[PDB]
From a paper:
However, in the presence of sub-inhibitory concentrations of ERY, ribosomes translating the ErmBL leader peptide become stalled, leading to an alternative stem–loop structure in the mRNA that exposes the RBS and start codon of the ermB gene and thus allows ribosome binding and induction of ErmB expression. Previous studies demonstrated that polymerization of the ErmBL nascent chain halts because the ribosome is unable to catalyse peptide-bond formation between the 10 amino-acid-long ErmBL-tRNAAsp (codon 10) in the ribosomal P-site and Lys-tRNALys (codon 11) in the A-site9. Here we present cryo-EM structures of the ErmBL-SRC in the presence and absence of A-tRNA at 3.6-Å resolution, which were used as a basis to perform extensive molecular dynamics (MD) simulations. In conclusion, this study illustrates how ERY exerts a dual effect on the PTC to inhibit peptide-bond formation, namely, by (i) restricting the path of the ErmBL such that orientation of the P-tRNA is perturbed and (ii) stabilizing the A-site crevice to prevent movement of the A-tRNA towards the P-site.
In silico sorting of cryo-EM images yielded two major homogeneous subpopulations of ribosomes bearing P-tRNA and E-tRNAs, but differing in the presence (termed ErmBL-APE-SRC; 85,393 particles, 33%) or absence (termed ErmBL-PE-SRC; 75,839 particles, 30%) of A-tRNA. Both subpopulations could be refined to an average resolution of 3.6 Å (using a Fourier shell correlation (FSC) cutoff of 0.143; Supplementary Fig. 2), with local resolution calculations indicating that the ribosomal core reaches towards 3.1 Å. The ErmBL nascent chains of both ErmBL-SRCs were well resolved within the ribosomal tunnel, as indicated by local resolution. Moreover, the electron density for ErmBL in the ErmBL-PE-SRC was essentially identical to that in the ErmBL-APE-SRC, indicating that the presence of the A-tRNA does not significantly influence the conformation of the ErmBL nascent chain. With the exception of the side chain of Asn8 for which we observe no density, we are able to present a complete model for the ErmBL nascent chain residues Val3–Asp10. Specifically, ErmBL adopts a unique conformation that enables it to bypass the macrolide ERY bound within the tunnel without even contacting it. In the ErmBL-PE-SRC, there is no clear density for U2506. However, upon binding of Lys-tRNA to the A-site, as in the ErmBL-APE-SRC, U2506 adopts a well-defined conformation, which is similar to that observed in the accommodated state. In both the ErmBL-SRC structures, the density for U2585 is weaker than other PTC nucleotides, but appears to predominantly adopt an intermediate position between the accommodated and unaccommodated U2585 states, hinting that the Lys-tRNA is not fully accommodated as suggested previously.
Numbering used by the authors:
A (entry chain B5): -8 to 0
B (entry chain BC): 2 to 272
C (entry chain BT): 1 to 93
D (entry chain B2): 1 to 46
Write the structure that this text describes.
Amino acid sequence: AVFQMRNVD
Amino acid sequence: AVVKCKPTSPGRRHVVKVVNPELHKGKPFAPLLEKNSKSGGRNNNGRITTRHIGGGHKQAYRIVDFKRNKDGIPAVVERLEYDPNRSANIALVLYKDGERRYILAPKGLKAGDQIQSGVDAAIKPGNTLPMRNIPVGSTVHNVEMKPGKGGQLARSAGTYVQIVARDGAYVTLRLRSGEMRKVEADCRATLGEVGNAEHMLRVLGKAGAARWRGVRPTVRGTAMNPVDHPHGGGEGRNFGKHPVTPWGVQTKGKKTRSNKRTDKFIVRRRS
Amino acid sequence: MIREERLLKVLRAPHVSEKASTAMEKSNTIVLKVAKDATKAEIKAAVQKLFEVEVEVVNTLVVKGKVKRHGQRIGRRSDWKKAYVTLKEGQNL
Amino acid sequence: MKRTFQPSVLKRNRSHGFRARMATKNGRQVLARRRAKGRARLTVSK
RNA sequence: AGGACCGAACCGACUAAUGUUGAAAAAUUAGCGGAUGACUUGUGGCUGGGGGUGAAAGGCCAAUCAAACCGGGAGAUAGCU
RNA sequence: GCUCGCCGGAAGACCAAGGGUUCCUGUCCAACGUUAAUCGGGGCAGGGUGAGUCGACCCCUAAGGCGAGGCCGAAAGGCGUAGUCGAUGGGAAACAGGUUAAUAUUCCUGUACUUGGUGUUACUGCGAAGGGGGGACGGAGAAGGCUAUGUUGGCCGGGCGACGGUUGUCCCGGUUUAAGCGUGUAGGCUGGUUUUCCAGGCAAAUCCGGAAAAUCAAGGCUGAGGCGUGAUGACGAGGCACUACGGUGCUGAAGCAACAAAUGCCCUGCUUCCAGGAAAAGCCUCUAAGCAUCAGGUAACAUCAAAUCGUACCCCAAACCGACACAGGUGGUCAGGUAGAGAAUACCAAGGCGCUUGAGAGAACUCGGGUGAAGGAACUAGGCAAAAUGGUGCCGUAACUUCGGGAGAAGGCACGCUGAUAUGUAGGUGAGGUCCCUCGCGGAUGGAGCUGAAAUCAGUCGAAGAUACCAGCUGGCUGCAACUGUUUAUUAAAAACACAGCACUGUGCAAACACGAAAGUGGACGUAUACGGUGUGACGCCUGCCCGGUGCCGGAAGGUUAAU
């Protein structure tokens, strides 16, 4: 599945 | 005689049908029918050379007698018929020998009319005779561009072409566009004008109305992306860029014409 | 047609089975394997001469060879064509 | 969910059959490479 | 009469729970939208990689797409770990 | 083996796709099965797929592919004519019963049918790659006439009830039969026959079409279904009999009527509406080049041939597609009883299953549910989730509006059972009797029988009668988009996209534009009331000003300027 998303802290 | 539709449910309120009661309902004169399969707007390469074309109801092509080669023989109308391919109505005239051919219908046409092609033919609407016999200023349609080629001019409904001049072998013609253009007098032409002048009145009235016409939805380029169309991006509609075709040719204010060979026939630009 | 030499190879081997015996003791239809090709007529004539008995009607079918396997290696058998030669009142052997 | 693989022998022979390989020189080169490599199955069928 | 109404098949996937090394690499359950049409679907073709297609999300093109996959140039380059 | 439980518009059955012996039997338990396993879709072995008329092959053609020459391109190659291939289409013909452990429209039994070869006889103008006809087609809607099928009655066979009754207005079961053939009805379509003439259908024409006459009014085509035949039978509940207790032989009663009735048939109809609805062959006819006592053509009989290939099993799944015996995905066909509007839903028939780990204990906690006293959003980012509303008939219903809406607005009443009206009414269906008939599958008269709601009155039971399943929450202000749709398959269904409409601009046809070095196509077998591009986004009121900068059009003297 791994997915994606992002890490905008 | 157009009749505005009553507002029963949305997509019906704005519809304006153009009924034509004198048309003969029923199956088409079968032998002259022939197949006309939809192209989808694609060519032999399979690329979409022309966008916004596809789908729609199937249509069957019908041969029409452009040349009107049967001079001298009297003709009589049998019945009017609808033509899916064209704005103008077609008509099934009966030649005295029993041969039948479709012809574009003049506004003055009615059932039983005695139209007759020929050089010696009397000047009444529905006749198809060479322009050399035609008096100046008479309404004219279905004009041949070449001697006996057919009659590509004024095929559309409500169109008419006045002949304002006859000097030389040529006769000058006034196109419906308003552009002037010389045409050889030897070319055949039909007197009067086609009667479907109500054709402009239709307004479709729904989003799905274009679907059977083979028309496909139009996506504006500003809503697209820079990679797909020169317009696009800008975060929130915007515009900025000078308007252009997707291939980059300048839209609005650029004559694409480049023939030169036919400039001699162009007496004047359209106004 | 005959051309005896072509017909002689048609009858390569009888195919005995428990069902075939019931076919013979009741339906009087002898059962045997035939050539991979051939036809309904040659199979008939082959019984008309060498079996010296009249044929009522001939039937044909092809039984696919069941696949076998041993380890990663596999081995299909071979296809063969069963035939049902119905005999008249003149049947013998 | 529907799988990407939706088998049909008729499309299969037409798309990847020996005749398709013979349809053009580029397909014949494929067979030439499969032969040079050595293979039990030059194509696929029955 | 209707891109008309309620509502199964059929199609679609708005909410919420469960699931999160699941029964399932996106489902199930309880509701939902459309359901004579711009409908859905079977079968068989067409458009081939800076190209295709797109009622336009830069989405999709065999579970991968701000440029598919396979092989080759190729042991590319890397002042970096 | 005896019971329970689930589906039953399927979790039953069938075909295609696809799989490829998983099918049947014997035997085996290492490995395969999320457990043991004598079992299995597992190992081994044997057996199993029977076609003139099911399908493919075959004839024909669509979108297309290929393509003699040809056109074009550095080469490879691309395009394309005549042609050829291409079904998801069209084109000749088998139905019932029986049988096997597994195959049956295939074998057997019974009754049949089509197209050709050959022969006999009779009559006679036969003959294309050509002409014409036919094949040959849309959406929606309206009924009517019927069948599949069901209920009830009658008939026949069987049963007097484990517990108070049950020889009667009782209970149970059966009441099944095709293609073919004869008959040509309910209907639908069209005025027929004959003579003469013609610039048409590339050649010709007796055919089609056109034009003049004459004559006559029913001439023909199409067509379900019914009724006969097929059928002295077949099937058949149930018995008589041997019995490897898994069955096999024989015999075998009644086999009708009435009503209801479809999504199936008549219907490729009819009516109606624009969006005006493939292609060719087989088929019916026409002659030409030709044969013309022939060959051929048509008809009755007889005979022969109908090959090759598929045929087992799975078919919404354990076997196809998902790495799995995986809660997913997979097209068409068959459509029982009761209630109901219904293919919804509940309970059942036929039939298939209890889903390949179980036995216990009855902690939290978690998941799936039921109920809860008092309060009723005090919870929370937020009425999220649950709860609630829910049917038919009738009363009645506002602001606003493009006068169609809003609207099922909102808000209420009635709803079970039984009797009477009427021992079953209004209606529907329809036999006998009677009469008329150019006499048929006729019509009128006549009304039995069957079927059958809805209403009123009265009575009656429960806390509750649309009692279960099934089955809208409603109103008010306002933002946005006109609306129906479409969109990030796999976190965003939206105000985003589309949209009809409006406007601008390009384009006179060998069009602009677009694919492609080209050739050739698309646009379009269209012709400015058309087409392309751009912007805007129904409708109503409208849409002001600025050409300095930027872009573009128009203008041709001068300034400037390339190759030469």
